[PDB]
């Protein structure tokens, strides 16, 4: 409850809200779900001046993402979707469309903001640990146990981000990850120490 508030205070320095009209209550709900991430990661994001940009429209309508217009994201071959239609982005930056958090809202991630932010944690905070030898061994055994095996089972950085999201979204998804991917669950458990 207190670390939740502390994480929300940290996020107030990371989250950028869009200009103009947007769904405020849902924006706050997205931040609330982000607050479940271990505070150690959020503070690292804050130190690197990583911004979580909440958007009222397409990602590609932002100047910094205009170069991705018409670009098919990694692993989206055959989906017919380009970055113009994708509601979330993570890595060196984080950009998220308000209202698209839940699985099925233009994506099949367990939660949009946690998945995208996990990428930034992976890349900025953990220096691409998803591509380390340790995790690749785990990814080789369990990367196909969370569905979407041609995306999660193929890219370790995506399996990491999606497992991270399962681990921190809520208690139900946390239990599901443990049963499905016990070595990944333990990996993320140790990472947070």
């Amino acid at each position: 409850s207190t670390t939740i508030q502390q994480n929300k205070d940290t996020l107030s320095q990371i989250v950028v809200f869009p200009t103009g009209n947007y769904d405020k209550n849902e924006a706050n709900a997205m931040v609330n779900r982000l607050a479940n991430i271990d505070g150690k990661y959020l503070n690292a994001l804050k130190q690197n001046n990583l911004k979580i940009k909440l958007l009222s429209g397409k990602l590609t309508d932002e100047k910094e993402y205009a170069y991705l217009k018409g670009v098919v994201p990694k692993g989206h071959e055959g989906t017919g979707k380009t970055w113009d239609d994708v509601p979330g982005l993570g890595g060196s930056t984080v950009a998220l469309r308000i209202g698209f958090s839940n699985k099925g809202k233009g994506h099949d991630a367990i939660n949009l903001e946690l998945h995208a932010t996990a990428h930034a944690i992976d890349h900025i905070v953990l220096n691409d640990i998803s591509k380390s030898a340790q995790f690749k061994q785990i990814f080789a055994k369990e990367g196909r146990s969370l569905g979407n095996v041609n995306f999660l089972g193929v890219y370790p950085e995506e399996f990491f981000a999606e497992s991270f999201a399962y681990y921190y979204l809520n208690q139900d998804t946390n239990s599901k990850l443990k049963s499905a991917c016990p070595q990944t669950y333990s990996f993320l458990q140790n990472l947070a120490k």
């Binding site: 979707k81 982005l89 099949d108 990428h119 995306f151």
Partner: peptide, 7 residues
């Protein structure tokens, strides 16, 4: 670096 969500 950029990474998309699960399709």
């Amino acid at each position: 670096e950029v990474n998309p969500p699960v399709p």
